[PDB]
Design a protein around this ligand. Structure first.
Ligand SMILES: NC(=O)c1ccc[n+]([C@@H]2O[C@H](COP(=O)([O-])OP(=O)(O)OC[C@H]3O[C@@H](n4cnc5c(N)ncnc54)[C@H](O)[C@@H]3O)[C@@H](O)[C@H]2O)c1
Ligand SMILES: NC(=O)c1ccc[n+]([C@@H]2O[C@H](COP(=O)([O-])OP(=O)(O)OC[C@H]3O[C@@H](n4cnc5c(N)ncnc54)[C@H](O)[C@@H]3O)[C@@H](O)[C@H]2O)c1
Ligand SMILES: [Cl-]
Ligand SMILES: [Mg+2]
Ligand SMILES: [Mg+2]
Lengths: 337, 348
């Protein structure tokens, strides 16, 4: 069929999903719901049908799927409601505020036989796909250390991202993208996590963080988000047994430097090269989502992967708060103590 | 004419350079040289320097006031305690000892014999570091709360005895001591916690690099890193404060400072395409929101190490490199090694 999607939450990302979803082959934006009149008015201006309630969205038999782009605390119940009403769900990152909440959603999805997919759009980021190529094709030999940094100097945007109750802060906002990229790329269990949160801005939520992650296969990674950074460190810095790579910024500027376990290095005998062309990740998120609904393809963004990321986020919070190194992503649910 | 006579013990790379360094001081000269190898004793003689046949002979010489110890790390403690007992003041190369307890022993002996022991922490005078010290003290970027200090290169481990655990080899003990000493000299706060990971990417029995994340009791954080397998270098300094950020790229002292203005609060950045999404928060701030400044002139550290050493001997000045500071660094190195070997975060 031509699948019909309703946007639930017509804010900054929700309104951009009209563009994204419409770009897919057999998917259409059918309507919108938002609790704010001004947001509903803006959607009406683009010709979009406005629903009176969320209940009205779910009762509409013409609607095949919903996109949930609300603040982070509402995601879970909205998703569960949708799936219980027979609707497939695309949910904005971070899907839930705890890993146990995703499990519950996955239970519902399995029971009603409807699909739930996290919007992890940044696996398609070109900078990341250049790193993916390098990692897979051994451009700098065995890549054993990765540094992934998103720096800005604008603080925390909007309203709800400042608040703990709405799943605010930068681990949840940007950290989930970079952690999802890391775990998508590296096929290895997490051996250890240490972390520090930034409260430089004096908010009740983190305005940035750093985490040091070691994998079972010996790969180490540093993942960093900052909002108080008036000079930026590079987007990517990666070390391999046969070279080093850098990607400075979103403009994809950078280079590789290679020597002409590791051989004894010398700075006098090196060659500088361009970054390779990005790896392919095909099709787009929304085309893959339609393929998944049609049962023609396996999902690129798997709920099992998303689950591991949430546990990792839970490990990061536990590690920063106790100022300890944690030695698995298991055991941070705090159900029993 | 009241010149202190210094003997160089260990005529290797640094020991031969100490001839030049000690000679530049006002009231101190190089009386001569001892090395355990006859090859190195000949080499010193062929630079017109007096040579001793034994370390015992240096220490028996009434004309000698002080010794400079520039031997591999495992021999520092015995040679220092010997010189002290013989009534000689001591300058010892970094890292002074391989354990913190060893330095406490030397400190005890120096006190008992009423002689001075000083660590050669020469990189406290580094121009790049003194720029950071200027920024830190003058609040150039407001209150500096996070510092990242990195020495990267792709030349591996140099020599020699530095490849071996027995002789206190590896990068923590080589470059780490300089960077950690800089940090602890700058920050007037006790270390609260340390996590660390070592690099063994070259396959040696000692570390070819490390990274550590340090937190102080006053909330200041630091990341210190040395790497010898980095074909691309990250900046020498990257520092963050309540009112700006600074960067020193390299030893050439290139870099800048970027600070917020009072107009940043009422302005809004114009979004860019960042990967698959539009971003406002990670977009450059609007033109009105920031000021870009040159790095300041470096703070003054005066006088030179060796003139300060003489001033300490003449009892006219306190030491710049204090032994208690050197002790806290060695305790930090011990915390780092423990943190990395147990894969834990070490507290105190
Ligand atoms: N994938 C990405 O690159 C990306 C980018 C930006 C935001 N996001 C995610 O998108 C979500 C929303 O982000 P945003 O920046 O658009 O926030 P926003 O504040 O701009 O939009 C949220 C909208 O949801 C509405 N809303 C709140 N509660 C609702 C309810 N229960 N029912 C229906 N509507 C409700 C609000 O009125 C608002 O219009 C968050 O989960 C965020 O993390 C993802
Ligand atoms: N402060 C700095 O910037 C800096 C720079 C380089 C080296 N160093 C330090 O200086 C010391 C020596 O370093 P190097 O690179 O010159 O080493 P090196 O190998 O070049 O020289 C050491 C010399 O000591 C001699 N020696 C060994 N055992 C001896 C003994 N028991 N008695 C007398 N002489 C002995 C050796 O024969 C050799 O000539 C080390 O502690 C190192 O950490 C410091
Ligand atoms: Cl721990
Ligand atoms: Mg996998
Ligand atoms: Mg002090």
């Amino acid at each position: 069929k031509k699948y019909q999607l309703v946007i639930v939450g017509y804010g900054g990302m929700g309104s951009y999903h009209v563009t994204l979803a419409s770009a897919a082959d057999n998917l259409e934006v059918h309507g919108v719901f938002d609790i704010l009149a001004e947001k509903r008015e803006a959607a009406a201006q683009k010709g979009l049908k406005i629903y009176e309630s969320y209940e009205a969205v779910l009762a509409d038999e013409k609607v095949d799927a919903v996109l949930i782009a609300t603040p982070n605390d509402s995601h879970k119940e909205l998703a569960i409601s949708a799936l219980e009403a027979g609707k497939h769900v695309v949910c904005e990152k971070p899907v839930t505020m705890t890993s146990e909440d995703l499990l519950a959603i996955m239970d519902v999805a399995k029971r009603v036989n409807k699909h739930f997919m996290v919007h992890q759009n940044r696996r398609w980021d070109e900078d990341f796909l250049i790193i993916k190529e390098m990692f897979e094709q051994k451009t700098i030999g065995e890549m054993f250390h990765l540094e992934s940094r998103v720096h800005g100097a604008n603080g925390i945007p909007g309203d709800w991202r400042h608040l703990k109750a709405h799943g605010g802060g930068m681990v949840l906002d940007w950290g989930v993208h970079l952690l999802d990229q890391l775990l998508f790329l590296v096929d290895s269990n997490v051996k250890s996590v240490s972390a520090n949160l930034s409260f430089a801005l004096g908010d009740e939520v983190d305005d940035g963080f750093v985490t040091f992650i070691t994998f079972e296969n010996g790969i180490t990674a540093q993942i960093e988000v900052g909002t108080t950074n008036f000079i930026k460190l590079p987007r990517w810095y990666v070390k391999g047994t046969e070279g080093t790579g850098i990607i400075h910024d979103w403009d994809l500027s950078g280079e590789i430097v290679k020597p002409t376990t590791m051989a004894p290095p010398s700075e006098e005998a090196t060659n500088t090269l361009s970054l390779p062309a990005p790896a392919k990740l095909a099709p787009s998120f929304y085309n893959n989502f339609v393929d998944v609904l049609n049962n023609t393809s396996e999902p690129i963004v798997q709920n099992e992967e998303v689950y591991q990321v949430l546990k990792l986020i839970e490990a990061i919070f536990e590690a920063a708060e106790t100022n300890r190194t944690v030695h698995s992503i298991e055991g941070h649910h705090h159900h029993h103590h």
